[PDB]
Enzyme design. Sequence first.
Site, short mmCIF file in Angstrom:
data_model
loop_
_atom_site.label_atom_id
_atom_site.label_comp_id
_atom_site.label_asym_id
_atom_site.label_seq_id
_atom_site.Cartn_x
_atom_site.Cartn_y
_atom_site.Cartn_z
N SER A 50 0.84 -0.99 0.15
CA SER A 50 -0.07 0.11 -0.05
C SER A 50 0.90 1.34 -0.07
O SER A 50 0.21 2.39 -0.09
CB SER A 50 -0.96 -0.10 1.18
OG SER A 50 -2.13 -1.01 0.99
N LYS A 188 3.23 7.00 5.10
CA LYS A 188 2.24 5.82 4.60
C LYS A 188 2.92 4.51 5.10
O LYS A 188 3.93 4.13 4.75
CB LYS A 188 2.31 5.95 3.07
CG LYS A 188 1.58 5.04 2.53
CD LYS A 188 0.12 5.44 2.45
CE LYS A 188 -0.96 4.14 2.30
NZ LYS A 188 -1.04 3.43 3.44
N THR A 189 1.99 3.64 5.44
CA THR A 189 2.30 2.30 5.69
C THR A 189 2.14 1.08 4.48
O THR A 189 1.32 1.87 3.42
CB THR A 189 1.40 1.87 6.86
OG1 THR A 189 0.12 1.86 6.48
CG2 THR A 189 1.51 2.39 8.07
N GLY A 190 2.61 0.08 4.44
CA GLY A 190 2.27 -0.87 3.73
C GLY A 190 2.39 -2.05 4.32
O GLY A 190 3.11 -2.56 5.12
#
Lengths: 248, 246
Positions: A50, A188-190
Amino acid sequence: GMHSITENTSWNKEFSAEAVNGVFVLCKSSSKSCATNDLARASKEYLPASTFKIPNAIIGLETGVIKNEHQVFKWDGKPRAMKQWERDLTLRGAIQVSAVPVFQQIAREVGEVRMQKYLKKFSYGNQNISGGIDKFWLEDQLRISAVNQVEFLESLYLNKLSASKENQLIVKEALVTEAAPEYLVHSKTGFSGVGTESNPGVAWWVGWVEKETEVYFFAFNMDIDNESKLPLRKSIPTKIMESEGIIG
Amino acid sequence: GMHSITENTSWNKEFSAEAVNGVFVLCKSSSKSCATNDLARASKEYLPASTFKIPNAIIGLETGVIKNEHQVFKWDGKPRAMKQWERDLTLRGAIQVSAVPVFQQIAREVGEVRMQKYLKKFSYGNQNISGGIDKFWLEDQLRISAVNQVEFLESLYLNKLSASKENQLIVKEALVTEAAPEYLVHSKTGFSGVGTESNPGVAWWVGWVEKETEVYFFAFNMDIDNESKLPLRKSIPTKIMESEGI
């Protein structure tokens, strides 16, 4: 090019404490002053998961698929894989809750030709979008390293991606996760998932921190085969950045 | 404009509780759906004080006096009215700490003819910049109503000011004061001072709230003759917005 990166194995302390195989890349001011716990892993490419919402959003805006920053992505009422997604979302909302189906439809509308074009313009990892337009970044062949994430985010920060400045600014506001008078975090995470036998998944945290007149770019990834380890993707980098006097 | 506004005197509660004279204007979605505790005061023009940093920043960028969002405003060591401002500052940092000296220099460089041109394009209050290029938004002269504040901020929100979309976006990110996954606040304080013998000063809070897929525009002012009352410029509009589910 011009990336100057120094290995500092003292940062391994936070990883070994948790038995995590991972990398942190932290740059002060620019990619000409970077440090990492692991030079080899800093350059190793992983599925972005993501974190790919950053380029995807910019491409959606550039291509007109996303009309403007005020577009509302309506829920059709049909089941989505996470409850958090079962609602109308803004562009920022969709990024912040990692609403995959929103970005899957954006991807489909962008289409393969335009997606390939922008990933070449952005130098985004191995630029391999094969395997299905609505899932490549989650499960196929697209791969990017922490180093490349840092260079991409730095370009975004400077408005130097091959996209309008206004589209870059829109996506930047969408990425703010902490705002204080003299301290601003964009992140932002993923998370690709827990992987498969002897092929772990990957978890990411990427972004930058503006403190006073300084800027720090960062990218973290780790091998993950158990969802209970997921919070380490923020706490390990937070601890490293705290130890450097940043988180503050 | 095209503002549709309803008086709701039940909102007077949170003022008279604190013996405050002031106004709150709150709009859902657009200026076509607004409410206030007092129509007359909602339209009454007051000194903007530091809320003027919003148009001043935009104009700074439009004119090129502000290079871009990465411009640093260097301190020169000469003591300043506030400790907080005795450091170098980004555009965002200066807005967020209301560093008046920085914006005075910006104003001077902008000049009268250009500052006047842009306040006209923005329909910013009475458009009175008389009394010195670096003074007019402090101490009298320029005045703006809560209604006009809301209209201006809605235009900014929608990128509809007569300025580049770029420059509007820059100033909008400089105004973020709270960021959560589905709650984003943009806001700016102002405070002219404690003023005089029943010529009290004015405190402002203006901005907008994005919650889920809805947006709420607000403007608050109050008369203030005692620096200790200053927290009410946030708490009263917070209590009102809370009562409306925001």
